[PDB]
């Protein structure tokens, strides 16, 4: 809790859905947004901060709260858009040999600035005396170790808590999340949403020799007609769907009501039947 990681993760597809099956987490209360909508929002960089606290201290990790650990080791303002992912770790971090390794900085002068790591080891000086290093009646060790033991109960067990602080500065977003992919359909007028390029058409097989850097493709007069598959390299062709004009030939509503229908721009195989120019 006094020296916590600050992993700045960026330039990846953060699939938060995988975290629901890695370890049996016991707390996944995301205060900022919903985990379903989190996978559809881009971000610049995520700050991963992990630590280990007791069971009765997990409730102290909140966007604004006082306590022996909430304002002395790690404080969260009222803008945390991440999660409070935490889980019990009483399977490998509890042996009967003396757990004089951790600490929680019981002594302090005042509340620390939120999102700050103070790595200090000086002797706590309680005023009215210059302590150049002494341990008696005026200046003591401001650090105290825990008493984690395997043969204990719930509430005082080692709980690993990891937070993922999010930020959106004036920088291009790198991490966005997972990307769903559908199956390919060829020779059928359907919709497509290829890498932002949205539309409808008949994805057919083309013989165009695209350059190794080109992705999209247009026509003589401002119309997308071919794109590159985001999957394995293949050159497609986007022709518009089956459309045309309809005209009605009618001898007039005075002798009969039989009418003829002329579809313009069709080979009688895309709608007696006759095919004319």
């Amino acid at each position, epitope marked *: 809790v006094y020296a916590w990681n600050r992993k700045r993760i960026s330039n990846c597809v953060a699939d938060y859905s995988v975290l629901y099956n890695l370890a049996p987490f016991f707390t996944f209360k995301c205060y900022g947004v919903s985990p379903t909508k989190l996978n559809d929002l881009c971000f610049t960089n995520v700050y991963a901060d992990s630590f280990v606290i*007791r069971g*009765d*201290e997990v*409730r*102290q990790i909140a966007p604004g709260q*006082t*306590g*022996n650990i909430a*304002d*002395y080791n790690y404080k969260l303002p009222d803008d945390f858009t991440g999660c409070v992912i935490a889980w019990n770790s009483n399977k490998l971090d509890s042996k009967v040999s003396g757990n004089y390794n951790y600490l929680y900085r*019981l*002594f*302090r*002068k*005042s*509340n620390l600035k939120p999102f700050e790591r103070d790595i200090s080891t000086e002797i706590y000086q*309680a*005023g*009215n005396k210059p302590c150049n290093g002494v341990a*008696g*009646f*005026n200046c*003591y060790f401001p650090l*105290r170790s*825990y*008493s984690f033991r395997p*043969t*204990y*109960g719930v*509430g*005082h067990q080692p709980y690993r808590v990891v937070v993922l602080s999010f930020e959106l500065l004036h920088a291009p977003a790198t991490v966005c999340g997972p990307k769903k992919s559908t199956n390919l359909v060829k020779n059928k007028c359907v919709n497509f949403n290829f890498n932002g390029l949205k539309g409808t058409g008949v994805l057919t097989e083309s013989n165009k020799k695209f350059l190794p850097f080109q992705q999209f493709g247009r026509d003589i007069a401002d119309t997308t007609d071919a794109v590159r598959d985001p999957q394995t390299l293949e050159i497609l062709d986007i022709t518009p769907c089956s459309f045309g004009g309809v005209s009605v030939i009618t001898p007039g509503t005075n002798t009969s009501n039989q009418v003829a229908v002329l579809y313009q721009g069709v080979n009688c195989t895309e709608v007696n039947v006759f095919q004319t120019r």
Partner: single-chain antibody, 236 residues
């Protein structure tokens, strides 16, 4: 709520071995059970804080091992003339007051801190019901603005209980008895640190004690120094 024997007078100093049951757990986390010797008149004095390593004092009271689910403080062979009350502290859970125990009469016979830092109070004689009375414990020695102090009240017959806990500079937690009607306000950071009554509800007639150190999360703090209390004597 803890379990303590009402009285203990048979076999003085041979098989007394008082304790405090009613825990039904492993003392939570840090196993630190303190023992306070409340004496009529002057303020109580610390006797032992951990299961071993007794502080500077009487050496005939040690071996406070935790047997089963209770710390059995070995008191046999101490003396045969004492009139006080032994109180034990446990239940160190997060934000849980009333850690003291009931009145245990450990009088083996029945019939037969002063200049350390400072000891001052307000002297609330004939307190009018309501209003706002301020009580201070100005200490010219240890800093009254950096250490973790507490306020504990006790009434005739009833035992002690946590009434006010204040951290360094970023916590103003109140007890469950007041539930909000008590507001702690710190005085100047270099003069003293006083309290506030804030329209008591006729239950604050108990006498107060401003301790320089915590009770349940007690630290060594060099030495445990207390101060004498004053009678409220409300006229509601």
């Amino acid at each position: 709520v803890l379990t303590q024997p009402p009285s203990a007078s048979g076999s003085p100093g041979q098989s007394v071995t008082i304790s405090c049951t009613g825990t039904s757990s492993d003392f939570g986390g840090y196993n630190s059970v303190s023992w306070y010797q409340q004496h009529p008149g002057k303020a109580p004095k610390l006797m032992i804080y951990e299961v071993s390593k007794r502080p500077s004092g009487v050496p005939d009271r040690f071996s406070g091992s935790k047997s089963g689910n209770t710390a059995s403080l070995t008191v046999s062979g101490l003396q045969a003339e004492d009139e006080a009350d032994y109180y034990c502290s446990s239940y160190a859970g997060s934000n849980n007051f009333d850690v003291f125990g009931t009145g245990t009469k450990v009088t083996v016979l029945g019939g037969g801190g002063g200049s350390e830092v400072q000891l001052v109070e307000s002297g609330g004689g004939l307190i009018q019901p309501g209003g706002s009375l301020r009580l201070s414990c100005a200490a010219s020695g240890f800093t009254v603005s950096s250490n973790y102090m507490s306020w504990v009240r006790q009434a005739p017959g009833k035992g002690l209980e946590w009434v006010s806990v204040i951290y360094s500079g970023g916590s103003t937690y109140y007890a469950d008895s007041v539930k909000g009607r008590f507001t702690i306000s710190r005085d100047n950071s270099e003069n003293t640190l006083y309290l506030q009554m804030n329209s008591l509800r006729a239950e604050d007639t108990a006498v107060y004690y401003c301790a320089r150190g915590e009770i349940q999360p007690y630290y060594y703090y060099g030495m445990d120094v207390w101060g004498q209390g004053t009678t409220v004597t409300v006229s509601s």
